[PDB]
Subunit: 173 residues, 3 copies
């Protein structure tokens, strides 16, 4: 579902997959090949949400922001895990937010970074590119390996392929 808020209707690319039970409200922009999964809520009322190209927002997640704080800005080929809370933060390209994590206002996650499952990235926290960061409050643990970087090169692209299988549902018996 797409809902209007004041003078704002969501701007959703024609190639974006939106699963059932989703609510996208107001000032939300979602780029090509991005894919939004079951029961996710993307609420752009008090502030804006922008999602780039080829990014997945997984099931039961919530995206929001705060009046007068940073907008929610998510780059390209990002993976946001199931049941995440993404709140007024910036996430760089190719990064992965582990399922069940919480990212608070004005935080920034560099590109090609893994946030471990169940992490809490607190307000204003700055996380560099190419690291593993995890815990509550989350801390930078180590640099990613070449294999982990390669995994991030393609994790979102596999979700794009998965979402195309759903977009062609009416082309399957």
């Amino acid at each position: 579902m797409e809902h209007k808020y004041k003078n704002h209707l969501p701007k959703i690319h024609e190639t974006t997959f939106v699963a059932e039970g989703v609510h996208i409200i107001g000032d939300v922009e979602i780029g090509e090949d991005s894919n939004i999964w079951f029961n996710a809520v993307l609420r752009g009322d008090v502030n804006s949400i922008k999602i780039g190209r080829g990014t997945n927002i997984q099931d039961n997640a919530t995206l929001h922001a705060s009046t007068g704080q940073s907008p929610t800005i998510i780059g390209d080929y990002v993976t946001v895990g199931h049941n995440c809370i993404i709140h007024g933060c910036k996430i760089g390209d190719y990064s992965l937010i582990g399922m069940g994590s919480i990212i608070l206002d004005n935080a920034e996650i560099g590109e090609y970074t893994i946030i471990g499952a169940g992490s809490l990235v607190t307000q204003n926290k700055k996380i560099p590119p190419r690291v593993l960061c995890m815990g509550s409050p989350a801390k930078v643990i180590r640099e990613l390996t070449e294999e982990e970087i390669e995994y991030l090169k393609n994790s979102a692209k596999h979700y794009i392929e998965l979402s195309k299988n759903y977009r062609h549902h009416h082309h399957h018996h």
Copy 2:
């Protein structure tokens, strides 16, 4: 959406805002200007849920309770953050439950208290009023400042304004 459970139909004030995807079941009472957000579940089957005036229950949250344990009692002008799990506990007026927190059966949160995001308030835990409490397990950190009290004086009221802007 409201659902009957046995003999119980939800008692929702005429001015309560309820977003889409919400399921409110059974013995649930919600007061004037309270506002319930997308995909929240308020399940009053095994015990009662009561929410006062001007309280927000944010998106993807779950409110439930347990047999023979404490009902869920939430006061006025309370903020319950996104994806919280609120279970058989008492929450005093003007308090804020940080997003993604879990509050277990028989816990009590005093009035004018902030629970930090991602906290776990354990069973039977009593958190005093006018403090910041955070962590898993959650611990009292310090008393709130008057600026934080003033924030709590208005956080729920700004949510009321927000809900009215949807023009339901």
Copy 3:
């Protein structure tokens, strides 16, 4: 709702309770008297999900799995708490996953085990039967008492009875 994915239709027992707002997709099998609560998502697209008999999956939870990793296999009379994330793991009979917990790929929870609320069981972790395990990352704390075993013997049964009252 039971959504088809490619050639996979969910196989749901006639006695399985499924609440409103639920999305069950693809290669998902759910057995007799199991009960799936409001807004839960059970997504069997990249891998399968199997749930036995008398098991509850509570509100706002998500079950999923990963390509090339272990399927999600949940036994009989299991309790999965509200807003849990259950991912490519095996859960033994009569176990209880405390609300808001996360179980990652290839983990195994032994039967008659309690995972404390808000816990994280990491990938490939094998939790023995008949213990309490809690924390993030979760650790085994102690063996369960007879009182707690009795509680696990009745927890899912109470959810079966609750679901039938709907």
